[PDB]
Amino acid sequence: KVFGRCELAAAMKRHGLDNYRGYSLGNWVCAAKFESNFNTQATNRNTDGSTDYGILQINSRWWCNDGRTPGSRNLCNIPCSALLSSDITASVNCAKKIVSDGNGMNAWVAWRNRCKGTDVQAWIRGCRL
Ligand SMILES: [Cl-]
Ligand SMILES: [Cl-]
Ligand SMILES: [Cl-]
Ligand SMILES: [Cl-]
Ligand SMILES: [Cl-]
Ligand SMILES: [Cl-]
Ligand SMILES: [Cl-]
Ligand SMILES: [Cl-]
Ligand SMILES: [Cs+]
Ligand SMILES: [Cs+]
Ligand SMILES: [Cs+]
Ligand SMILES: [Cs+]
Ligand SMILES: [Cs+]
Ligand SMILES: [Cs+]
Ligand SMILES: [Cs+]
Numbered sequence: 581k582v583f584g585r586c587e588l589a590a591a592m593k594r595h596g597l598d599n600y601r602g603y604s605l606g607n608w609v610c611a612a613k614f615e616s617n618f619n620t621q622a623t624n625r626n627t628d629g630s631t632d633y634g635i636l637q638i639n640s641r642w643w644c645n646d647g648r649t650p651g652s653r654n655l656c657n658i659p660c661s662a663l664l665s666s667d668i669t670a671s672v673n674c675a676k677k678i679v680s681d682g683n684g685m686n687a688w689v690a691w692r693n694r695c696k697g698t699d700v701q702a703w704i705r706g707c708r709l
Contacts, residue, residue, distance in 0.1 A: 581666035583618040585609060586707035588635070588668075593709055595672040601679050605709070606700035608675075611691040612636055613703065620671075621664050634663035634671045636688070643674055 583591070589609050592598065598605040615637035616622035624632045630641035630649045640649040644660035656674035663671050678687050685691045 581620045583612075583620070583635070585613075585618065585703065586709075588612060588618055589704045589707050589709060591668050592672065595669060597672050597675070598709075600676055601684060603679065603685055604700065606703040607685060607691070607695060609703035610695035610698070610700045611685065611688050614690040614694045615688065620666055620668065623664070631660065633660045634665075635668060636663075636671050636675050637690075638663050638671065638674050638678065643678060 589605055592608050593605060597608050612618055612635045616635045618635065620635050622634060622637060624637065626632065626639065626641070628641065630639050630652060631646055632639050633644060638644060638656070638660070640646040640660050641652050643654070643656045644658050644663055645654040646660040656677055658670055658674065663674065679685055681687060685696070
């Protein structure tokens with residue numbers, strides 16, 4: 581599923597991500613825009629052999645099992661395919677664990693490089709939330 585910007589903002593809020601660990605909803609929408617262009621089915625292979633899955637491009641190295649990432653963990657206790665669903669619940673639940681891991685949203689390199697410190701409220705401007 582390719583979400584609309586306001587559509588995704590609303591889903592993320594519904595799932596409790598708005599201000600989770602102090603990160604406003606715009607931060608989450610901005611990260612999804614640059615991670616997946618809002619497409620739940622986004623996959624991207626990393627140089628190390630791990631793969632990133634879904635709207636927030638969650639990495640198999642730590643967070644989900646794909647069966648082909650040697651020496652990895654599965655700390656969200658999910659198959660990585662669950663992160664590609666049109667329903668975002670599993671991605672949001674896993675992202676809550678990731679953002680709580682010590683480095684906040686810097687866990688997402690694209691958030692750090694393209695969202696961090698910007699007018700992230702623009703990503704939710706105009707949305708009925
Ligand atoms: Cl929308
Ligand atoms: Cl957009
Ligand atoms: Cl915001
Ligand atoms: Cl594996
Ligand atoms: Cl594990
Ligand atoms: Cl599995
Ligand atoms: Cl959803
Ligand atoms: Cl933080
Ligand atoms: Cs990647
Ligand atoms: Cs790419
Ligand atoms: Cs790649
Ligand atoms: Cs990525
Ligand atoms: Cs493993
Ligand atoms: Cs596990
Ligand atoms: Cs789970």
